[PDB]
Amino acid sequence: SEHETRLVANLLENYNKVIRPVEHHTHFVDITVGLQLIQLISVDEVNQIVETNVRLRQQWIDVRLRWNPADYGGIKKIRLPSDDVWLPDLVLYNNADGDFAIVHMTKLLLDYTGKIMWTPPAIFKSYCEIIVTHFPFDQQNCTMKLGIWTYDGTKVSISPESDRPDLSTFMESGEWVMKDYRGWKHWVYYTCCPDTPYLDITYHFIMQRIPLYFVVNVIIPCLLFSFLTGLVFYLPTDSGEKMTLSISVLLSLTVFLLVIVELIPSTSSAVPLIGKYMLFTMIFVISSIIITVVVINTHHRSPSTHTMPQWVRKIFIDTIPNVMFFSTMKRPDVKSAIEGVKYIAEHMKSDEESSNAAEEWKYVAMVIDHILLCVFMLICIIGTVSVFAGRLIEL
Amino acid sequence: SEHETRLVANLLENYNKVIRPVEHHTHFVDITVGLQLIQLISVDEVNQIVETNVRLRQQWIDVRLRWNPADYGGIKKIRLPSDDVWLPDLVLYNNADGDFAIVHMTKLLLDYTGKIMWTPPAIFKSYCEIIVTHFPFDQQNCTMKLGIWTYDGTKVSISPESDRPDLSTFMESGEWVMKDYRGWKHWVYYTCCPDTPYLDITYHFIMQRIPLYFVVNVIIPCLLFSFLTGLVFYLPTDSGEKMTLSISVLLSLTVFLLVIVELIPSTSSAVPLIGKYMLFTMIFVISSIIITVVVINTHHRSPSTHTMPQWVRKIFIDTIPNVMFFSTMKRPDVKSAIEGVKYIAEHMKSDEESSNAAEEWKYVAMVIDHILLCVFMLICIIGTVSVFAGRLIEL
Amino acid sequence: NEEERLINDLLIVNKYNKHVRPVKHNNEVVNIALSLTLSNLISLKETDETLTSNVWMDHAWYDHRLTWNASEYSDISILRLPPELVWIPDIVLQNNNDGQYHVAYFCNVLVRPNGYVTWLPPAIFRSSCPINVLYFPFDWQNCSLKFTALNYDANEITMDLMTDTIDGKDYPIEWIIIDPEAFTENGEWEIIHKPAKKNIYPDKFPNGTNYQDVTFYLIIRRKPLFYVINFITPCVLISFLASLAFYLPAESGEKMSTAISVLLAQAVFLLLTSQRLPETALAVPLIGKYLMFIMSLVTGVIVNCGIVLNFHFRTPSTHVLSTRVKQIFLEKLPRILHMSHDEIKSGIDSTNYIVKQIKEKNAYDEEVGNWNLVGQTIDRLSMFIITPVMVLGTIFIFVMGNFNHPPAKPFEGDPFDYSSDHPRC
Amino acid sequence: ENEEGRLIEKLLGDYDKRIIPAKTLDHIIDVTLKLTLTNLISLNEKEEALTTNVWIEIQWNDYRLSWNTSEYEGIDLVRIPSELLWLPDVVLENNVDGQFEVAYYANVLVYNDGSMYWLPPAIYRSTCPIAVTYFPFDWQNCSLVFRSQTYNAHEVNLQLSAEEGEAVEWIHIDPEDFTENGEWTIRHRPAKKNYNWQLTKDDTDFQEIIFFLIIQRKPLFYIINIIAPCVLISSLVVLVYFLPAQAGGQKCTLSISVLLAQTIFLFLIAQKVPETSLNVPLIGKYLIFVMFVSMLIVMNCVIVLNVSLRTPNTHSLSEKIKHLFLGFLAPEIKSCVEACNFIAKSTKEQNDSGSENENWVLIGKVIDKACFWIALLLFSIGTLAIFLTGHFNQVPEFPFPGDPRKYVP
Amino acid sequence: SVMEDTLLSVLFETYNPKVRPAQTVGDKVTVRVGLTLTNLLILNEKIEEMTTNVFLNLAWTDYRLQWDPAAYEGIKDLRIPSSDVWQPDIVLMNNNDGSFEITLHVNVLVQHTGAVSWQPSAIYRSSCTIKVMYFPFDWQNCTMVFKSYTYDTSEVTLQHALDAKGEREVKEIVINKDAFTENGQWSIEHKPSRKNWRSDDPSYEDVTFYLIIQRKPLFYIVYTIIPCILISILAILVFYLPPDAGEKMSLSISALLAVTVFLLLLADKVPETSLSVPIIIRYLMFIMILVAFSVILSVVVLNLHHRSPNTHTMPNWIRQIFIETLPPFLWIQRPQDLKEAVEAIKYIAEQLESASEFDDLKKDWQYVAMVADRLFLYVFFVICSIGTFSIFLDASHNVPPDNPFA
Numbered sequence A, B: 001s002e003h004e005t006r007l008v009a010n011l012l013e014n015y016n017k018v019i020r021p022v023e024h025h026t027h028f029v030d031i032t033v034g035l036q037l038i039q040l041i042s043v044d045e046v047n048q049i050v051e052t053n054v055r056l057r058q059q060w061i062d063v064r065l066r067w068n069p070a071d072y073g074g075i076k077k078i079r080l081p082s083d084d085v086w087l088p089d090l091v092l093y094n095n096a097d098g099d100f101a102i103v104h105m106t107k108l109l110l111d112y113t114g115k116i117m118w119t120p121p122a123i124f125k126s127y128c129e130i131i132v133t134h135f136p137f138d139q140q141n142c143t144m145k146l147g148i149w150t151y152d153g154t155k156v157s158i159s160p161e162s163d164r165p166d167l168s169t170f171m172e173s174g175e176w177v178m179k180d181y182r183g184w185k186h187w188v189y190y191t192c193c194p195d196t197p198y199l200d201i202t203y204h205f206i207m208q209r210i211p212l213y214f215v216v217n218v219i220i221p222c223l224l225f226s227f228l229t230g231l232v233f234y235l236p237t238d239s240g241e242k243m244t245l246s247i248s249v250l251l252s253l254t255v256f257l258l259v260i261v262e263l264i265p266s267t268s269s270a271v272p273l274i275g276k277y278m279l280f281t282m283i284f285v286i287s288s289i290i291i292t293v294v295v296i297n298t299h300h301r302s303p304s305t306h307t308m309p310q311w312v313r314k315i316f317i318d319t320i321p322n323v324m325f326f327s328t329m330k331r332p333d334v335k336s337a338i339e340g341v342k343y344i345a346e347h348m349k350s351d352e353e354s355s356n357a358a359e360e361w362k363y364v365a366m367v368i369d370h371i372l373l374c375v376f377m378l379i380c381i382i383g384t385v386s387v388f389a390g391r392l393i394e395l
Numbered sequence C: 001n002e003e004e005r006l007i008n009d010l011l012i013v014n015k016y017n018k019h020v021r022p023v024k025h026n027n028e029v030v031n032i033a034l035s036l037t038l039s040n041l042i043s044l045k046e047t048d049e050t051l052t053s054n055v056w057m058d059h060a061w062y063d064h065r066l067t068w069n070a071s072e073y074s075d076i077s078i079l080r081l082p083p084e085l086v087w088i089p090d091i092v093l094q095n096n097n098d099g100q101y102h103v104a105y106f107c108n109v110l111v112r113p114n115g116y117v118t119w120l121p122p123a124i125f126r127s128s129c130p131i132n133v134l135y136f137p138f139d140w141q142n143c144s145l146k147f148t149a150l151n152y153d154a155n156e157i158t159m160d161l162m163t164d165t166i167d168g169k170d171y172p173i174e175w176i177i178i179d180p181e182a183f184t185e186n187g188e189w190e191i192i193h194k195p196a197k198k199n200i201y202p203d204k205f206p207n208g209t210n211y212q213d214v215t216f217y218l219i220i221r222r223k224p225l226f227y228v229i230n231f232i233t234p235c236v237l238i239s240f241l242a243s244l245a246f247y248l249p250a251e252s253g254e255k256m257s258t259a260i261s262v263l264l265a266q267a268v269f270l271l272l273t274s275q276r277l278p279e280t281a282l283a284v285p286l287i288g289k290y291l292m293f294i295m296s297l298v299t300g301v302i303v304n305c306g307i308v309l310n311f312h313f314r315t316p317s318t319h320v321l322s323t324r325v326k327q328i329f330l331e332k333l334p335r336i337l338h339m340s341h342d343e344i345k346s347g348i349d350s351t352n353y354i355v356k357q358i359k360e361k362n363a364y365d366e367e368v369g370n371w372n373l374v375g376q377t378i379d380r381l382s383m384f385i386i387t388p389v390m391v392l393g394t395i396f397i398f399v400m401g402n403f404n405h406p407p408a409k410p411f412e413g414d415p416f417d418y419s420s421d422h423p424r425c
Numbered sequence D: 001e002n003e004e005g006r007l008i009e010k011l012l013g014d015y016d017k018r019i020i021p022a023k024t025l026d027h028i029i030d031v032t033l034k035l036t037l038t039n040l041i042s043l044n045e046k047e048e049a050l051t052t053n054v055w056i057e058i059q060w061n062d063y064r065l066s067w068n069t070s071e072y073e074g075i076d077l078v079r080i081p082s083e084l085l086w087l088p089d090v091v092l093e094n095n096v097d098g099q100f101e102v103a104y105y106a107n108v109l110v111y112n113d114g115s116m117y118w119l120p121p122a123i124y125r126s127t128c129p130i131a132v133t134y135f136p137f138d139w140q141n142c143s144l145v146f147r148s149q150t151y152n153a154h155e156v157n158l159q160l161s162a163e164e165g166e167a168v169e170w171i172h173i174d175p176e177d178f179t180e181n182g183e184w185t186i187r188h189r190p191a192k193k194n195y196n197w198q199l200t201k202d203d204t205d206f207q208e209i210i211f212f213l214i215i216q217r218k219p220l221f222y223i224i225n226i227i228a229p230c231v232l233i234s235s236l237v238v239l240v241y242f243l244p245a246q247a248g249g250q251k252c253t254l255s256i257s258v259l260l261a262q263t264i265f266l267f268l269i270a271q272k273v274p275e276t277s278l279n280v281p282l283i284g285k286y287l288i289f290v291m292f293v294s295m296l297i298v299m300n301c302v303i304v305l306n307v308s309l310r311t312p313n314t315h316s317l318s319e320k321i322k323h324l325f326l327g328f329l330a331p332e333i334k335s336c337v338e339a340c341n342f343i344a345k346s347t348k349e350q351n352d353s354g355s356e357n358e359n360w361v362l363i364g365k366v367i368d369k370a371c372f373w374i375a376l377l378l379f380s381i382g383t384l385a386i387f388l389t390g391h392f393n394q395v396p397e398f399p400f401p402g403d404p405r406k407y408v409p
Numbered sequence E: 001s002v003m004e005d006t007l008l009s010v011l012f013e014t015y016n017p018k019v020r021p022a023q024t025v026g027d028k029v030t031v032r033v034g035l036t037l038t039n040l041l042i043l044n045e046k047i048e049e050m051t052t053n054v055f056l057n058l059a060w061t062d063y064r065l066q067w068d069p070a071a072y073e074g075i076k077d078l079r080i081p082s083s084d085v086w087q088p089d090i091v092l093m094n095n096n097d098g099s100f101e102i103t104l105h106v107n108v109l110v111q112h113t114g115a116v117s118w119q120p121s122a123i124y125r126s127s128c129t130i131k132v133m134y135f136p137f138d139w140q141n142c143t144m145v146f147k148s149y150t151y152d153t154s155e156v157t158l159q160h161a162l163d164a165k166g167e168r169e170v171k172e173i174v175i176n177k178d179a180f181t182e183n184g185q186w187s188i189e190h191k192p193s194r195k196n197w198r199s200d201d202p203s204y205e206d207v208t209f210y211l212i213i214q215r216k217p218l219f220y221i222v223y224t225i226i227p228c229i230l231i232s233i234l235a236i237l238v239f240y241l242p243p244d245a246g247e248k249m250s251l252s253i254s255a256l257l258a259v260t261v262f263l264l265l266l267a268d269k270v271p272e273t274s275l276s277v278p279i280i281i282r283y284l285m286f287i288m289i290l291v292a293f294s295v296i297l298s299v300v301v302l303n304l305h306h307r308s309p310n311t312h313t314m315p316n317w318i319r320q321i322f323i324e325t326l327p328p329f330l331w332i333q334r335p336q337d338l339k340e341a342v343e344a345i346k347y348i349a350e351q352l353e354s355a356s357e358f359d360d361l362k363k364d365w366q367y368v369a370m371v372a373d374r375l376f377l378y379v380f381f382v383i384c385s386i387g388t389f390s391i392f393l394d395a396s397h398n399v400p401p402d403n404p405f406a
């Protein structure tokens, strides 16, 4: 367009993009800043960095860039490269490891009255406190602080476009649900002087994690291992496999600890819920193995070297089985030949006595196993409910 | 300074930075190249890349940038951006995947006589022929080849500043030790023409790896597995755990193979020393398992099906136990009743005979275990020494 | 320095426009002879099918504007000019991975008084070559570097392979140039063939940028030593360990432990192998085929050991030893397999009862021993059937893998070797 | 119109950003640095690099950019982009990557007297060699070395910024907005000017400003995820002494399975410890110790099982060992009577052999008891000592040992 | 040539590349947007990103770049650097990284009629949501949204590109067989193109290119499904093992070890989104729970097997169910010295009789265990077969639609 060509030629002829767009140096540029959230790329719990794809809408008036439409064929709006005109140096104050200012210098829309609309894109990597205490049922509040880097509020004033960020074209995250979002403007003063306000706009987003991936991928196998380590106590000691079952459950828990460390964040600020439940499962399995060793020792108790204490006989043989209602447990040469037959008979007598004592020891061990099976199933249920119920009810 | 401003204005007024700084085009610029190694960032054995942080010190004389200090208030040196003057295009010839030339265009020092000093920083990624034959007790020698990319020796000549790179400010690596370093200049000619030398300066660094991380992380567990391998032969067959113990040792070695795979380099140029040692450990464990299977089969042989060969009886029951000094092993109805008692007596005949034969089989198996224990401890010790001390004595 | 005056005349006085082709009339063609020099092969990481290479693009063309009379000036026979001052043919690697189409370092061009221009910029290229996993890790790949001229159509510039002379006859350089001295062999890959071809596509049109092509091919063979040492031999030995479960007597209750732990080790090897290969589905990799076969066979070994243990522990109180089973497993197969006064009356009644009980116990024991013999026979048959299958399968699979040399001649229908030793004609 | 426009067009007219603003020969520009730490992003032990987000404050005087306020309607401060002005080439020297410069080139505040205030934010990745001896109960001592890469001590004079006449000899951390890293806590943060006496006042490396960060790790993740499970699993080896020493006792099963679990933990920790080889980390020491203890206990289980399953046929139980261990530590009638005598004799023999078997079993039990006490003492003492050495690894009370000052505001 | 120099000097004397070419105030510039896919590089599911190597076939008309070839030795077209002419800021809007624009700036083709054609290449990383429910037997629907970043419908009018002999629009992604690499993990089923508007916003218009791609699951099939099937077979087999072997627990719990190892293998390959559970993860969890129940029932069988009258009293209901009822259904169906010597013999006989009765009751308990074990074998075989078959048909009935709907 020849009209637009002439307009652009005459509109930047004596335009210095170093100078503020104010009629007088005592005035301030009023910039309307609006933030539009396009996508939540990721949340890094370990480094406490939130990555978002945004459009940073900025509006201000530049009196030097106005023209009369009647002199240029009725043109009212033109597009100019953003690097041709003065721009506000908005900086993400809580930038973690990304770009501090806008780097994509897209074209801006210039109105014949000097009103400018600039909406560059950006990737914000902002630092925010991640609270891994109820992980994976955790809610995060991560913010974006924006302000003019080198001007105070008497020279360049920024105000929010609306009280909430624009999430009209937001993409559903698939890992996070956006509970709430708002934008606030702050006035900050210093001991220097109370006539020089410093302005910032903070946008915060309340994010709730969708706890389906972590539940299925971590918590369910832990529940399985807790149940199995409880189950070990129904296995008879005669089948020489109590140690096999218990220690193989421990080995599976170790492999799954490898998996867990692969999956959950490696933070150290606090113990997550999964960390607590994993440690509880580990202690449960270890206690199960120790008590199984104790039971195996009691079951193979030699009657020749050991005699059953009276209190053990009174407790585990007399009273406890009576209260276990659901169980099904019980509540010439002829002289030499004659002497040999007598010897065989008396050896059978001794063997029978020893077998009776050993069977009493085995019965005591079996009753102890019944008690521990009931107790450990109760502990598994109580611990599983207790570790998660507070958070689940909290939601 | 106004004097320096005027001097810089005069120096570059008619200065063309695309022309070589020679009075006559038949002359050559003499450039003194020195390399200052600051830090050895990393060595990549698999991809054969050495990353180093260096400074490329270049000195030359630019006749066009002379001035009289008396005419400019006594100024004798100034700092100029390197982009303003002719620069030599030095290229790292053996660059792997970094920058070929200098990318940090820092300022340079210029004397009033035209002598120029330029020390830009750079990150050199060089291709390094890696020898993994003696890993992790390996010494790596690899180089940095530097030369003028587009000029031959009759236009631009490069001379080493010293005989060896400057390691005055070299940070200690913590994984490598600088054994030696030197720099050599080479003249290369081509079948074209013997009047056109092509120059290069090659700096080589001889590095000795510090073998503590790999030792404690790989070799020690292999030593434990090797020692545990021969231990199964002292475990009696009556305990049903020979296969359990040996196969669990094999599983431990297989799991440790994850650590070896994730820690050692994945080159195929040669088998590393610890690769040989681990393959030895694997074959050792598998041999122990096979021979343990044979021993268990021997111990349970039944007299009914198998009869002891005469040579086995001669060798393992009579000969070897004598020469095993370490071991402590030794070297009406009444007629029916009468008939039944006779039957019981003859059945005990037969049972005693069969038990004695099975006892002979068990004794042979035990003797074989003792011999195998001695042999396997000897083999483990000899194999470990033969694999490692051969390289270790050289150090 | 006369070079300054010469360059001023060439570029400034003559009004050299670097955005215009060096043609006297706008119907001629600029011929750009290009060659590729492989500085080093960096990597062919198979997970994302990317070939990283350090190559030096050799460019050559004529520029009638950059011609001068060497006598009118001092005897200047060559100039060095930055590429940003002169017209440069933009030749880009089209099949790149990372978005790097251009050369890495824009070095000076060399101009002769006759207008001959040579340009040798170095580059790091990350091109995409698909991975053929069929014979992994005994495989050879055929990776390609495709260069196109996207700034001009074929009617304006023609790409060609550079030519060289030996004894007065010029021949095209139909290969990637590798300097035998400077080149360091890659840690994993050995280069077998390195042809170069100029490709025309007749289905396109000359007035387009998709009509011409210069492609450099790298037929490289993997060196299978890391995988043989760390992956193949331990898996083979541990797998063969499962055959010992059959030689392990059932009385020693450890058949199942041995076989199942062998299966666990094979699962660990599967975990190791899954990480080494891309996700493609053209074919199952050879090591994957072997892992599948050997895991299936170890599962069969476990099942048959379970069957044997089921047979070994049968008793007359729960099972009946039929005559058919006795004939099959106690007579036929072991032969085939070459296997190896009231008081005294009360006393008399009591001893008669004792004798009867002992006789019944003896009959029970002998039939249990018969079951044990049946189990032993099944073990022997299982070993004789499965161990040869396991050994033969392993041997056949790995000799088929080891018999996978490259075809010794690229471009199957072409009789030319494309070797630097024998240029055409 | 904006008088700033006329003022700036006057100032930058005939202004050469290549020229140091040295008024005369032998005039040295004073450049003052003040580092503000915004975020301690990470300290990657594998790469030995510390990533930080800082706002570096650089102050100097440029006599060319001075103006008389009365001539410009009382304007005493203008903003000019840093790319149009001379800047002191203050860079981070000990950077792992090639990033010497700041990240964002902010405008420079220019005052009417020539004073210039530049506050560019920067993302820095600096070299921090790792002291691996006490990992993960360790504290690191990372430093940020700042110096001018262009000008030497004869041209610029780097100094620490001074507030109210007191030198700011520390990294500034704003107490409210600063967020804890979550793995590292800052104990000391001194700042000082250093000299390389091996050089002269030339070479641009003679003088430097160093900011130190003594940070202590918070090893909660390792304790909950590695240390506690590893200790719990390793303690199981002492239980093998209460299992019976026969088939079905499963001594070897338990001990070797614990050793296999320790191997799994070895793999897990191999992914966390740094690759430097100047010291063995505390966690690596503890894994080596527990693996060696597990091997010893497997050996002892094998020895006990060998002893307890001895038989009068394979070995002879000499009375010396018993004292050492069980001490300090009609023809038809004739045929029938012959058969009865033989039966009695055979039963007697079997009972004797069995009896000597229980003798061997008792010896094995005594060995179990003694070795259990020894092994429990060994494991407990070793674990306590190893993990108590780490607990006493405290940060020094002073940032510099012989320096009495605390270097805090 | 010299005439090219003169023509370029004439064309760009007052030409401003910042100005959109509009004959009259209010005119709209027609921009045709086409796409040529050279390579579908990656579809990383962990980050929900597609990498492609593409050409943008852009064409528009610039009235300022008009000349009469008869006056310039018949120069019909020019190759002008792309930065010297106005171009619409056609960018990829749904990019995952921050790179909106093209990567390679090939120079434009300008014809004497003013028709400008531009075919830049780029490596684009667009963001498409992954439907993780039938993974890895899944088809994905990944789009590429192209529009002018700056100009709206009041300034430019987007259209579809024309074919080689421009007569009708191409409403598809163009694939050139000479330069196109099959991904090897993804098959392109449909590749339509459509223009999209927005009811709320009348100034919005884009050209979207849709790629309907189906995964080839062979890698996952092998590396997860075959071992899972083998482990399920072992879980079934554990019930054929006799309790006297002392090997049930080894088999079942080692199968559990194998399942959790396969879970470790698969952890680093499944996408971490929480909208659904991929069918492979559901199959692993079903196998894990089946193996856990095999462990539980093996423990139950072992407990029943090792019972004796000295510890338990056998209830009537167990005897009725497991001994009388089930086996036919499961096909099992089972002088002072003389007086002293006489007393000793009598005592021995009584001991043998008591032991025989005890052994008979123990055999009853063991038979109950055997019958229960066979019942578990059949039940687990049926359950495992039905579950695996159901999951496999569910996965295999997942096919991309015949009509792309776009």
Ligand SMILES: *[C@@H]1O[C@H](CO)[C@@H](O)[C@H](O)[C@H]1NC(C)=O
Binding pocket: D068, D069, D070, D071
């Ligand atoms: C600044 O200018 C005013 C006139 O506007 C003059 O009176 C004053 O002396 C000047 N200041 C200096 C320091 O010269």
